[PDB]
């Protein structure tokens, strides 16, 4: 029962070389280099899937800060005022408002202002 | 399989467009040295190409010229086109069989010598197809 390796062996090679189908140089042509690069790509993508939450939250916070500073309020005071007012709209929707519906955002800024400690 | 139009060189080089082609296979010259002349000859009018290759100093100018002439002759026989209204639409060089040889070096060593070959393909079409 002598078995030849090729039929079983080429499957993972085809898979890896398909996953490396935009890489530059040896990384898209040779199975060993493509395998190393796919190891790195998997590590990178797992890490960036977790870092995406923080990245998008940072972008939302920056946009909310910019839109609330045009109304004379800092981001920290705006967030504290929305917390005190009870309006639980998250930073994703707050940034969506700050871009698309700036009048609704300014009304929310007024709501946050009226709900500050003022002390 | 049981499908029509088995693949052919004409269908891949011309594909129902008027024109013709020629291939010189196993030319005992390296593919790079043939390409140095083929890059000059590609896209040119065929008669201008053969007259220029008559004067090109390179050794690969004599093979390629012949190929072009053969292509022109083919177009003058299967299509009725004249030589003066043909242009070299496509031109490329592929590698042929490379013979292995040994050159004896110093201190009992032998270095490897590769005798390379080339296949030269030239496809000619009427000049009216240059912009179409």
């Amino acid at each position: 029962a002598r078995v030849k390796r090729s039929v079983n062996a080429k499957k993972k090679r085809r898979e890896v070389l398909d996953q490396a189908s935009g890489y530059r140089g040896q990384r898209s042509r040779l199975y060993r280099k493509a395998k190393e690069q796919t190891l790195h790509s998997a590590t990178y993508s797992f890490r960036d899937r977790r870092a995406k939450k923080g990245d998008f939250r940072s972008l939302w916070i920056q946009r909310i800060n910019a839109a609330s500073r045009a109304q004379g309020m800092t981001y920290n005071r705006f967030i504290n005022g929305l917390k005190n007012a009870g309006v639980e709209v998250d930073r994703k929707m707050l940034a969506e408002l700050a871009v698309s519906d700036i009048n609704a955002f300014n009304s929310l800024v007024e709501v946050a202002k009226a709900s500050q400690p003022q002390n | 399989m049981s499908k029509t139009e088995r693949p052919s060189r004409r269908a891949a080089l011309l594909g129902d467009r008027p024109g013709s082609y020629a291939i010189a296979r196993h030319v005992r010259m390296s593919a790079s040295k043939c390409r140095r002349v083929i890059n000059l000859v590609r896209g040119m009018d065929a008669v201008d190409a053969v007259t220029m290759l008559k004067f090109q100093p390179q050794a690969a100018a004599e093979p390629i010229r012949k190929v072009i002439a053969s292509a022109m002759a083919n177009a003058e026989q299967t299509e009725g086109l004249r030589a003066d209204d043909l242009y070299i639409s496509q031109a490329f060089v592929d590698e042929g069989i490379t013979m292995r040889r040994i050159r004896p070096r110093a201190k009992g060593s032998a270095s490897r010598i590769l005798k390379r070959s080339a296949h030269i393909t030239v496809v000619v079409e009427p000049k009216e197809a240059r912009q179409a």
């Binding site: 998008f56 972008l59 939302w60 920056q62 946009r63 909310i64 910019a66 839109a67 500073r69 045009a70 004379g72 309020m73 800092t74 005071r77 994703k92 940034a95 969506e96 700050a98 871009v99 698309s100 700036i102 955002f105 | -």
Partner: protein, 146 residues
């Protein structure tokens, strides 16, 4: 999907800051913020959404302490013994544009886009600028309370 600006979607404005008696650091922070569009809700780090900043009276920039002589700016040509040093006071008197541009560049991300956005900072040591065709509007450096 979070909003992303499209190429030339966000309009870029022209501003003129009067740097008379304005601290170099305050002016540089404000200019870097304006150049990168950090004051806009449509901000994007990868798309240039910033404005054009003109700074006049760049020779009258205020420096505290002994900075006009003791605060040094260095350059090196790369060949040995090729270091030159000047003071920020002499830079402001001689090449105010270079001084303001160095201060601003130190305050931006080290990028290709930042090198493109620094080209929007026009600096003049005198009170006048040649950009009246672009109608720069006055900008006042101000702080928001609390």
């Amino acid at each position: 999907t979070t909003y992303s600006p499209k190429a030339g979607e966000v309009q870029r404005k022209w501003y003129v800051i009067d740097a008379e008696d304005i601290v170099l650091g305050r002016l540089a922070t404000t200019a870097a913020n304006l150049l990168r569009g950090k004051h806009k809700p449509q901000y994007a780090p990868h798309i240039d959404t910033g404005d054009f900043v003109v700074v006049v009276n760049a020779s009258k920039i205020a420096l505290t302490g002994k900075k006009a002589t003791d605060s040094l700016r260095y350059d090196h040509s790369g060949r040995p013994g090729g270091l030159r040093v000047t003071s920020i006071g002499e830079m402001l008197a001689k090449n105010p544009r270079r001084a303001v541009e160095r201060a601003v560049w130190g305050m931006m991300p080290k990028n290709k886009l930042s090198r493109q956005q620094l080209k929007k900072l026009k600096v003049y040591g005198g009170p006048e600028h040649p950009h009246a065709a672009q109608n720069p509007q006055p900008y006042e450096i101000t702080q928001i309370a609390q």
